[PDB]
Design a protein around this nucleic acid. Sequence first.
DNA 1: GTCGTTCGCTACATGTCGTCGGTCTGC
DNA 2: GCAGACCGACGACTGTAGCGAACGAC
Length: 395
Amino acid sequence: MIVDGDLHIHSHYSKAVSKLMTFPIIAENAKLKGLNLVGTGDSLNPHWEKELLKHSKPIDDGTFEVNGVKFILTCEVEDKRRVHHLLIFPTLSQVREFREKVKIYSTNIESEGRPNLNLTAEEIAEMANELDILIGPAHAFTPWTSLYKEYDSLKDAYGDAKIDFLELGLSADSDMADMIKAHHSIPYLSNSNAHSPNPHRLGREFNRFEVKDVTFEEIRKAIKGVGGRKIMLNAGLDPRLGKYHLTACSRCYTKYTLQDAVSLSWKCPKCGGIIKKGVRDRILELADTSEKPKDRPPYVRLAPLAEIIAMVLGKGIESKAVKLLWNRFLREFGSEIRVLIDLPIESIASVHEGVAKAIWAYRNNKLIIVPGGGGKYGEIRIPEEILKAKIEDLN
DNA sequence: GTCGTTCGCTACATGTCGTCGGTCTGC
DNA sequence: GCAGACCGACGACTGTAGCGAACGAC
Ligand SMILES: [Mg+2]
Ligand SMILES: [Zn+2]
Ligand SMILES: [Zn+2]
C-alpha cells in the first residue's frame, strides 16, 4: 500500500510554536490534507508521551493511531554544538531508555519539545545506533542550527558513527543534496519541521512510501529500501521558497551574493545585520561530483496550495476566503498534492478558473518566483498575460 | 446608508544558549 | 594602556492576539 507521511513536527511544548499543536488538531488537519502517516515529534518529553497514550490507540508497540491517522515516535533534539538531530524510535521502551539515558546530560528534557543535550554528535549517534534508533541531521543546511553550518562533512560530525537518513528541508531538493558524493549512500527525507497545523504549514513536505502495512518496521524497511518496501517519492517545497535558499541578511533580508558576502565579511552595509550563508551557496562550497545515483527517488517541487489560493485571490494567507476555497477544494478532491500535480487543469477549473490557471503556470514553470533568504520565505507572483488569458489558448 | 464581518499589518511572547559587541579589572 | 575576565542584548526555534480600517449582505 502507498502511504504519505510527514515525520517531523513539534508539539506545543516546543518554543515559538502554536498552542493548537495537539494530537486531535494535528490528526484532523492531516486527514483533511490527505496525509496517511504523521510523526509524533518531541517524543522525549514525558508530558507529550502521556498525551499520546491518552488520545491514541496502539497498533503495535511503536505505532499508534488517532482519528484514522497513524503515528510513529519521532523527535528533534539539539547538540552541544547547537545542531539539530532527528530521531525515530522503534518502540516506546526505546523512547524511555533513551530518555533516562540522557537525563544526566540535559536540564530541559522534561520541559521542552526540542531539548538541549550536552553531547557530541558522535556520542548521540552512537547511543542511537546502540538502541537501533534512527538518527539523521535534520535540515542540515540551515546557517543557524544545522550540521553543515558547524561542520564540513558528515564524517567530521559523526566520526566512527553511522546515521540512517538525512532530512533535506525546505530550501533544498534531491539534486543539490546529491551533488555531494557521500550523500549518495544515504536516504533522503523531505519533512516540514512544522510548528502550526495550518494548511500551508502542516505537511508542506512529506514522503510517499510503498509498504505492506502501516507500522514502524515497514517504514524502516522502506527507508532502507528492502523487502519490496521503498521510499518511492519525496514531495517537497521548491527550494526557492525556503527561508534560507539564497544568502541574505537576518534583519533587512537583502540578498547578497557569496562573493559580496565574503567582501563585506558578513556585515550588512545598508542595515548592519548579520547576513547568513544560504543553503545554495553552502552546497556550492561543498561541491563534490556532478553525478547522482539512479536509485534516488524523484523529488516533486510543490508549492503550498493555500499560498497559491492567497496569491490568486489577492488576499492574505490566513484570510477567510482562501480558507473557504481550500476547504471546498479538499472536499471536492483528495489531497493537496492531487490538485497541485496529478489533477488535470480542466477539472480544477470546475471549482475556480484563476486557481487552475495558476496551477498550470506552476506546472509549466511560468510562475514568477522570487527566492527567500535569511529568514524570509520565497514569494510567488503570476504574470498578467497568464491571468487575463483563457485556458484553451494557454497551452 | 448600517453595523456586524473580515483584512492586513504591527507587536510580542516562552527560555535556553551561542554570538557579538561593549565594559571592567588587574597588570 | 591592554590581555583577559565580565556583562548585556539579541535572535532562532514562528505563530498570533489585536487593532484600526475597509468590507459587504441588509
Ligand atoms: Mg524542499
Ligand atoms: Zn529543527
Ligand atoms: Zn541587513
